[PDB]
Design a protein around this nucleic acid. Structure first.
Lengths: 37, 142, 58, 175, 206
RNA sequence: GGCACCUCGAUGUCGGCUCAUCGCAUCCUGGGGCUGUAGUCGGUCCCAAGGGUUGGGCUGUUCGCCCAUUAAAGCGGUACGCGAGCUGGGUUCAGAACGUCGUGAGACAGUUCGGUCCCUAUCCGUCGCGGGCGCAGGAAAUUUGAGAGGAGCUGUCCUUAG
RNA sequence: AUAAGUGCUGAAAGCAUCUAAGCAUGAAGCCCCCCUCAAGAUGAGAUUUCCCAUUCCGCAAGGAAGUAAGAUCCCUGAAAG
């Protein structure tokens, strides 16, 4: 769970979605999930 | 020399239904009829206003996401203490608070302001305690 | 005077601004705010001016 | 490539009823389901046919059109044949047993736990190491499955607690 | 809930059949009488208000005499009311006595405090005092007012004033013996208030 | 630190004592995510300001270092909080000396010993306590509660179970 | 009732997706529950009980003069000061 203002898909099977106005990224690797801000 | 009326006034009793009128527009028009600015013989120091009664204070609706976004701050005079409650809060128990401070901020400030807020009463439901004043139903315009 | 005139116009279902606009294209209404206010205290005459302005407006 | 466009069916005595304001009540062999919808959707029931349409073509309209289509499908299918979600608890001492309507599940916690389904949602314990819930609607089925999972979601080293059917859990090597 | 009202006669110790020593509070309570049964549909809530001990006819006045004449007793000096009681349990004019309590029950106790008067901050709130030596002219003063920027002192800086006389509640007290013959109560602990004063005793809400 | 904008017809300057109060960019206690997280322990990050956040030795010292505890020994703001509340150890007078500089009178963010801290509270403000009046008759009691305050902290041991 | 978080169902965008529609769970945190004050709350609240609506004047606008219930002054005091 990273909290970075810059959100990148770390690997190709991460996918970027928007929840509650804040951009997340979800991947089945739990090491790759972060929110923006 | 125009007539500045004093103690030549009759007070009407008005009923307005608040179930489907947003409190911003409702407060804005209710402040005007509380001022008596609808009355033609208005003077700014004798309170030619009209008694109004709210009906269904419980059913106000709010535009946008104000239902949980509007905060009602209040500050007791003791140090380091602030109280707040949201807009969807006090719908549960006292909408009369939301209305009463809405028209309190609506109408002018001063001794006449207190005396002129004095005429307004606000209740839940659709039931007057009083019918002896022969209250007529009036609708909003804007 | 203006807010009294505004009340007089609104209770005939008219805005004050449209009222004076209609008066001005109705003619040179040299009648002014004080005596229009006295026309409010003689309101039937104020009605007799208001409908003339309204009917002239269109 | 449009799920909200396709049609739905009434196979075997699926009594779909349209109520006053876009409200639907269906009584099938499994039971009765009821649901209320905001009235901008047009739902008309024909013999073995039910309609769904949106007034305009824009974002929220498309979204709620597709969702209400899938949801009507979900209620009619659940009231037709029902739904079940299996669950296979794993480990070395973990014990799950029926205790009437209420379930008693024995986990390494110093106390046994308790779950009381009440919504017409029924549970079945076919084996010691495998449990299943039975319910009319998939939503409440998944809710009860979620609370059973939340008693002990598994660990990534050995794997314990509660597991869904074929649920792949991540493996971490603990030295 | 349940509770009575009495007069605090004193406090002592009593042994309790095991070797340990138990200080006790001694409260005599003549059997109280319920005078009015406050009900919801007119009073907004349900309660019973009851009187504790008598008065002479000299100090009795006509209004309270008429109020008491419904329950047909002597005039009552000490009247209080309780909330949360069983509404139908008490008929108006009945007594309550002391036996509704039994030894070993946890008890909420409430009484007025001992009045002390105008005491300084040292006694009043127990913050420490300055040095007694090394040049200190700050022997027993109540501390600095506050900062400078707010241009005023805040509310609630704790200053010298009167003590006492303000009712206080001690929770979870334990009744060790009841003497219904003499109409006496005997609670472990220490109970606030001066001698021969008000004291009310309740079943603990905890 | 830069600028010189209010104050030289005076706005008392370090530190300490008494008293707090606020913010959160959280030291503990609360809830979680990831872990190069087996478990006892941790690392980071997020939500969280309710409460708490120790006694000594040394130096005027804040600061530090050390001793011993604690769950923890937080960071900051409020005229580097608080002298019409206190302290006067140091800087910040007049005496005297040392080192150095100056031919000298003398001088040193160099040191050392000694060295007068005024005020009867007017109005706000604060903490208590009274009198009047009001509450469309006059009284004695019992209350409702808008709305204010306070408390709101934690360890150790046993068992589950080696 | 929530925060971070964990979700259930599901389209937009045939899949996926705690999400936009809905349904949940979730903190020494918020409101209550605990204790105290509190109707000057001028919005001056409520309950029970007692006194009764006398004498004069302008007759009446309203005053004044004895009172009832009930208080007070004064005195003995303290558990209060």
């Amino acid at each position: 769970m990273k909290v970075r203002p810059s959100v990148k898909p770390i690997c190709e099977k991460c996918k970027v979605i928007r929840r509650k106005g804040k951009v997340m990224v979800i991947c089945e690797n739990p090491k790759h999930k972060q929110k923006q801000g | 020399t125009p007539m500045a009326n004093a103690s030549t006034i009759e007070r009407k009793w008005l009923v307005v239904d608040a179930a489907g009128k947003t409190l911003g527009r409702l407060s804005s028009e209710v402040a005007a009829i509380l001022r008596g600015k609808h009355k033609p013989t208005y003077t700014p120091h004798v309170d030619t206003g009209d008694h109004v009664i709210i009906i269904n204070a419980e059913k106000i609706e709010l535009t946008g996401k104000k239902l949980t976004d509007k905060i009602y701050y209040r500050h007791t005079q003791h140090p380091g203490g602030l109280k707040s409650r949201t807009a969807l809060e006090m719908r549960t128990n006292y909408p009369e608070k939301m209305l009463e401070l809405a028209i309190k901020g609506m109408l002018p400030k001063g001794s006449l302001g207190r005396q002129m807020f004095k005429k307004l009463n606000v209740y839940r439901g659709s039931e007057h305690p009083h019918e002896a004043q022969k209250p007529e139903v009036y609708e909003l315009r804007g | 005077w203006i807010t009294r005139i505004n009340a007089a116009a609104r209770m005939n279902g008219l805005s004050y601004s449209r009222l004076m606009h209609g008066l001005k294209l109705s003619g040179i209404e040299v009648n002014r705010k004080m005596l229009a206010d006295l026309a409010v205290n003689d309101l039937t005459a104020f009605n007799q001016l208001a409908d003339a302005a309204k009917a002239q407006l269109n | 490539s449009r799920v909200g466009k396709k049609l739905l069916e009434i196979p075997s005595d699926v009594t779909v009823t349209l109520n006053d304001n876009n409200t639907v009540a269906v009584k099938g062999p499994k039971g009765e389901l009821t649901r209320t919808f905001h009235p901008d959707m047009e739902i008309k029931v024909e013999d073995n046919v039910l309609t769904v349409a949106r007034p305009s073509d824009q974002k929220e309209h498309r979204a709620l059109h597709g969702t209400t289509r899938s949801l009507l499908g979900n209620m009619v299918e659940g009231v037709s044949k029902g739904f079940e979600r299996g669950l296979e608890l794993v480990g070395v001492g973990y014990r799950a047993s029926k205790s009437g309507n209420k379930l008693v599940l024995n986990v390494g916690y110093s106390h046994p736990v308790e779950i009381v389904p009440e919504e017409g949602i029924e549970i079945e314990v076919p084996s010691q190491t495998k449990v299943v819930v039975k319910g009319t609607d998939k939503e409440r089925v998944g809710a009860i499955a979620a609370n059973i999972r939340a008693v002990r979601s598994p660990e990534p080293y050995k794997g314990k607690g509660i597991r869904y059917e074929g649920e792949v859990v991540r493996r971490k090597e603990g030295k | 809930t349940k509770g009575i009202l009495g007069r605090k006669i004193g406090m002592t110790q009593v042994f309790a059949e095991n070797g340990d020593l138990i200080p006790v509070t001694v409260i005599e309570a003549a059997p109280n009488v319920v005078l009015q049964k406050k009900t919801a549909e007119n009073d907004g809530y349900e309660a019973i208000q009851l009187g504790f001990d008598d008065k002479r006819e000299k100090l009795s006045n006509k209004p309270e005499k008429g109020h008491v004449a419904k329950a047909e007793t002597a005039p009552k000096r000490f009247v209080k009311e309780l909330r949360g009681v069983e509404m139908d349990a008490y008929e108006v004019g009945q007594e309550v006595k002391v036996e509704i309590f039994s030894a070993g029950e946890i008890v909420d106790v409430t009484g007025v405090s001992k009045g002390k008067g105008f005491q300084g901050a040292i006694k009043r709130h127990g913050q420490s005092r300055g040095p007694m030596s090394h040049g200190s002219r700050y022997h027993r003063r109540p501390g600095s007012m506050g900062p400078v920027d707010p241009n005023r002192v805040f509310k609630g800086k704790l200053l010298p004033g009167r003590m006492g006389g303000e009712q206080i509640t001690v929770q979870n007290l334990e009744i060790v013996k009841v003497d219904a013959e003499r109409n006496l109560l005997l609670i472990k602990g220490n109970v606030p208030g001066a001698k021969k004063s008000l004291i009310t005793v309740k079943s603990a809400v905890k």
